Amino acid sequence: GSAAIIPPWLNIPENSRFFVIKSSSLKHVKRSFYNGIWSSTHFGNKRLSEAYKKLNSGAKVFLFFSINTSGRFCGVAEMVSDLKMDLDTSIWEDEQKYGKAFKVRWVIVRDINNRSLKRFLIPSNEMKPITHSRDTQEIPYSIGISIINLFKTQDSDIFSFLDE
């Protein structure tokens, strides 16, 4: 039936960090999924890279992928490398808009309806809902964990961008 991906185990330890990713296209999300990379802007990449660098022990960086205007929140990926000089950034339309790529692994692939994400208010984006976040907006650990738990729910209506 469903093509959605929800792993049986996912542990996210203390000092892990959560950011929103806003993509211009469903195209680029899919390509991220099949190639296992992502590129933000030079400035977004700098924010993400500085966070990744300072990780200690088994702390992780997770990315909530969202598509602008549709507001589709379509899955979660872990950042699993820093910025690389030699990954294939040619998969991006208008490549020079974005910087160096870094590796990602898509841990969860399924949609969450905007309706049920409006509840989450983000203290450092003037307390707006998470659906108003711009690209690389940081999300406090505790809120991020609660959003992962919604993503992990084996809902009977579950849909993904792999269904299609």
Instruction: Measure the N-to-C terminal CA separation of the chain; round to a whole number of Å.
Output: 12
* Tally of helices (H runs) and strands (E runs) in the chain: 4, 8
- Cα torsion 164, 118, 65, 95 to 10°: value is 100
Name beta bridge partners: 102.
38
Question: What is the resolution in angstroms?
Answer: 1.8
- Taking the C-alpha atoms of residue 19 and residue 27, their distance in angstroms, rounded to an integer, is 20
Number of other CB atoms surrounding residue 64 within 10 Å: 25
- Taking the C-alpha atoms of residue 35 and residue 78, their distance in angstroms, rounded to an integer, is 14
- Taking the C-alpha atoms of residue 45 and residue 83, their distance in angstroms, rounded to an integer, is 7
Token pair listed for 134: 């711009």
Q: Which residue has the tokens 């699993």?
A: 80
> Does 22 show up as a binding residue in the annotation?
yes
Contact 78, 10 (CB under 8 A): no
Per CATH, the homologous superfamily of domain 1-164 is ph1033 like domains (3.10.590.10)
> Does 11 show up as a binding residue in the annotation?
no
CA–CA distance from 104 to each of 65, 115, 118 (Å)? 12, 27, 26
CB proximity list for 151: less than 8 A, separation 6 or greater: 6, 75, 76, 108, 110, 112
> Does 38 show up as a binding residue in the annotation?
no
Contact 151, 108 (CB under 8 A): yes
- Taking the C-alpha atoms of residue 124 and residue 140, their distance in angstroms, rounded to an integer, is 9
> Does 35 show up as a binding residue in the annotation?
no
Token pair listed for 62: 């997770």
Token pair listed for 53: 């660098």
> Does 24 show up as a binding residue in the annotation?
yes
3-state secondary structure of 72: strand
Contact 2, 117 (CB under 8 A): no
Token pair listed for 123: 């203290």
What DSSP string describes 10-37?
----TT-EEEEEEES-HHHHHHHHHH-E
Name beta bridge partners: 104.
79
Pairing of strands 17-23, 61-67: parallel
